[model samples]
Target: GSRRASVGSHRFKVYNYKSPTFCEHCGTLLWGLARQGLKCDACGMNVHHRCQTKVANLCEFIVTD
Candidate 1:
């Protein structure tokens, strides 16, 4: 519910990440260690905050960065 989430191509809203989740970008565990989580909210695709620019808003966009 805040603009703090959206940035550049990260159109969807980001929020305090759910622990039972993983970084859709780095293939690592988000596990609540990170302070944020980004998801399409529409497609349900999300990436770790660190991956916002590297991975963009697309989740299935296999990360190579």
Candidate 2:
């Protein structure tokens, strides 16, 4: 099975509402059973898609001009 990875950004975003109860960050239920928000690997301390640096996993790669 694939592990829950919050690639690119610092937080994880779950587009599927499966196994959902509520958003810990927003304190709201996934409307229509649709979950399109960020998640925490450890806990729901953060959820904003742009919540790390407000944010990034950092530049895994770099581009030059």
Candidate 3:
């Protein structure tokens, strides 16, 4: 169990991104065909398939007005 072992509520999904991005977890460039990496649907955390399991879930705070 790591930092985000059970507490990470990050809902990551495979994305065919049109814009360039680097892996937030590994800090490496994401370059490939098809699904390059993952993007958290909740807090927009971008990560790689190889780097996903190690990242901590620091999701954004929700605001209500």
Candidate 4:
């Protein structure tokens, strides 16, 4: 028999958490969730309300613009 060990690496940095409220897709800071309502300002990534139902348990952090 042989013994083996696994190693993993990760880097963590401190972030102030203050970010833009505007969407990264369209620059629009609209009210909604990430899966359905939230839109990316720089890429125009839009999602429908019904489509976001699967991620009901997810939490979102609101960033300031």
Candidate 5:
């Protein structure tokens, strides 16, 4: 199996945004048309598709508060 760190059960999917949105990872604007980025369905973590692999594996679901 592919070795990927657990993202707290975060399931990211391609999402389309109508308004300007910044990537949580790169802190840059998600440019282009629809399906500009990915968003985790579990914790609603939004990030660029390119920066997805670079984002910290800290999903809200498994964070210790």
Candidate 6:
């Protein structure tokens, strides 16, 4: 049921990983393609330039705030 809920939907984040890559409140990806400027790909999830934090790898989800 859970997997079905996310089907046909693309989850936008700074990186694609198995961990939580979105804000608990907004679901915005923690990272972006640009160096700065938060952008959401159809989702309301967003991150500020100052709020961007680097993860060990793109395969990992950033669960910290």
TM-score for every candidate vs. truth?
Answer: 0.52, 0.32, 0.74, 0.19, 0.73, 0.23
Q: What's model 1's overall lDDT?
A: 0.60
Off by over 4 Å in 3: 1-7, 63-65
> In what order do the candidates fall by TM-score, top score first?
3, 5, 1, 2, 6, 4
lDDT of each: 0.60, 0.44, 0.78, 0.32, 0.79, 0.39
lDDT digits (tens) for residues 1-65 of candidate 3: 22323334688899887878899988987788659999888767889998888987566645444
The candidate that wins on TM-score is 3
By descending lDDT, how would the candidates be arranged?
A: 5, 3, 1, 2, 6, 4
- For residue 20, model 6's alpha carbon misses the true position, in angstroms, by 27
For residues 1-65, write the lDDT of model 5, one tens digit per residue: 33334454557899998899999888999887899999898787889999987876766554343
Q: How well is each residue in 1-65 modelled by candidate 6, as lDDT tens digits? A: 12212223324445333443554334465454343334345443444444435311122222333
- Write the residue-wise lDDT of candidate 1 on 1-65 in tens digits: 22223333445567666467777778877656555677765456667767777864433222333
Runs in model 4 lying further than 4 Å from the true structure: 1-20, 32-65
Q: Report the candidate with higher lDDT, 1 versus 2.
A: 1
Taking the tens digit of each residue's C-alpha lDDT, what string does model 4 give over 1-65?
A: 33332223111221222343443334444343332244323223333333333322222333344
Candidate number with the higher lDDT (1 or 4):
1
> What's the C-alpha lDDT at position 4 in model 2?
42
Give the per-residue lDDT digits (tens) of candidate 2, residues 1-65.
33443345333545555564554445565554454555554334434333333433332322234
RMSD of 1: 10.4
Error of 1 at 15 (Å): 2.5
